[PDB]
Amino acid sequence: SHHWGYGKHNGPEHWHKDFPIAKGERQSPVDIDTHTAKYDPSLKPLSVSYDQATSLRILNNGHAFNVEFDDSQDKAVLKGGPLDGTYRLIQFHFHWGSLDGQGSEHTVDKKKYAAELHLVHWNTKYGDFGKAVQQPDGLAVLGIFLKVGSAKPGLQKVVDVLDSIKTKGKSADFTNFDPRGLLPESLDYWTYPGSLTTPPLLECVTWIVLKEPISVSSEQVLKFRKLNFNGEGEPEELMVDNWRPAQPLKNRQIKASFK
Numbered sequence: 001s002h003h004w005g006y007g008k009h010n011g012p013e014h015w016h017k018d019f020p021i022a023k024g025e026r027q028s029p030v031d032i033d034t035h036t037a038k039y040d041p042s043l044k045p046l047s048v049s050y051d052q053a054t055s056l057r058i059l060n061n062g063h064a065f066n067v068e069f070d071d072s073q074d075k076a077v078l079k080g081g082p083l084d085g086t087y088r089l090i091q092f093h094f095h096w097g098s099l100d101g102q103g104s105e106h107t108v109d110k111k112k113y114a115a116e117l118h119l120v121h122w123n124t125k126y127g128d129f130g131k132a133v134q135q136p137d138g139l140a141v142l143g144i145f146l147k148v149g150s151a152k153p154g155l156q157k158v159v160d161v162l163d164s165i166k167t168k169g170k171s172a173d174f175t176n177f178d179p180r181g182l183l184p185e186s187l188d189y190w191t192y193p194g195s196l197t198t199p200p201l202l203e204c205v206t207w208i209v210l211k212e213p214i215s216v217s218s219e220q221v222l223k224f225r226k227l228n229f230n231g232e233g234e235p236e237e238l239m240v241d242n243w244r245p246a247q248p249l250k251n252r253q254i255k256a257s258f259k
């Protein structure tokens with residue numbers, strides 16, 4: 001059964017024993033060295049088209065919480081930038097720390113943010129998510145850093161439902177949530193080819209990491225940290241530090257959309 005996690009005994013340093021691609025050639029996350037990333041004029045404009053997004057449910061899966069979308073039609077898609085074709089939004093989730101000084105998966109010149117949002121999309125040419133994760137261009141994940149400062153108004157409906165999904169396996173209705181309220185003003189980004197950052201660690205992802213972080217309040221991220229990795233009735237293990245550290249860049253280049 002899967003028993004990977006983020007503790008000492010089942011965390012990122014152990015994952016390779018059951019998921020040997022953990023030591024692969026295009027693992028994520030990575031450190032983004034901003035001086036080494038090169039501006040790429042070939043990049044087409046990035047198009048985040050979430051007008052018709054239809055959120056359904058929020059789930060504590062024992063590793064993070066996912067806000068799930070109806071991905072049965074092109075209702076919420078990502079296109080442009082480095083991407084060929086159309087990528088459909090299926091879910092978003094976060095990674096965060098025990099303290100404000102850590103939590104992000106990607107780093108920027110070795111700087112760790114308090115958290116990182118992942119909007120996960122699959123390439124519609126492959127028909128379903130499960131087929132998409134058999135392809136090197138199957139997925140696109142839009143990554144957004146969170147820093148602690150002013151509250152993010154569009155995040156509060158997420159924060160407020162977390163009390164209802166404290167433990168692993170719980171879910172709640174989560175309709176009519178607009179993910180556009182989680183974006184920063186600018187869509188300036190870095191991009192590189194990588195992987196899922198959790199097991200199974202599949203090398204299918206075009207990463208698009210926005211340069212501009214969003215600000216969330218301390219009270220908002222503190223409510224993340226009250227979630228549990230454990231199931232109901234089990235000894236409490238706070239859901240914190242559910243991030244993988246940066247992995248070797250190997251034979252990759254990170255491209256910037258901006259000067």
Ligand SMILES: CCOC(=O)CCc1ccc(S(N)(=O)=O)cc1
Nearest residue numbers: 003004009010014015016017018
């Ligand atoms: C009771 C403590 O139990 C353990 O330490 C967990 C065993 C265990 C450790 C790591 C993994 S992995 N390679 O999927 O990350 C699987 C199972």
Ligand SMILES: CCOC(=O)CCc1ccc(S(N)(=O)=O)cc1
Nearest residue numbers: 118120133141195196197198200
């Ligand atoms: C083969 C089935 O695999 C899955 O369900 C993967 C789910 C999954 C989606 C996205 C990510 S992340 N942090 O890289 O955005 C990790 C894991």
Ligand SMILES: [Zn+2]
Nearest residue numbers: 093095118197
């Ligand atoms: Zn993630």
